[PDB]
Amino acid sequence: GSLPCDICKDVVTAAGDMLKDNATEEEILVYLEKTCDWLPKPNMSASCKEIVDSYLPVILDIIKGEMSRPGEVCSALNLCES
Ligand SMILES: [Ca+2]
């Protein structure tokens, strides 16, 4: 998906790191949404926030299982080429 794929992978990486830091699921949601502001253009930051809102909760459920790396997780969600 290019951008949606790139964003998905950054999200999965960040979520995993925060979970290890004992962050709550809401703190992760709040933080990734704010990190989306690092994307240089308003439209890109906006699409990043929608991906975070739409996928972070399911990503948290997925990574509690056997699959936890960005590539494998984002390919499963079909945000990155299978
Ligand atoms: Ca900024």
Swiss-Prot record:
Coiled-coil positions: none
Cystine connections: C5-C80, C8-C74, C36-C48
Glycosylation sites noted in the Swiss-Prot or TrEMBL record: N22, N43
Domain Saposin B-type residue range list: 2-82
Descriptive protein name: Saposin-A
Source organism of the structure: Homo sapiens
Chain's gene name: PSAP
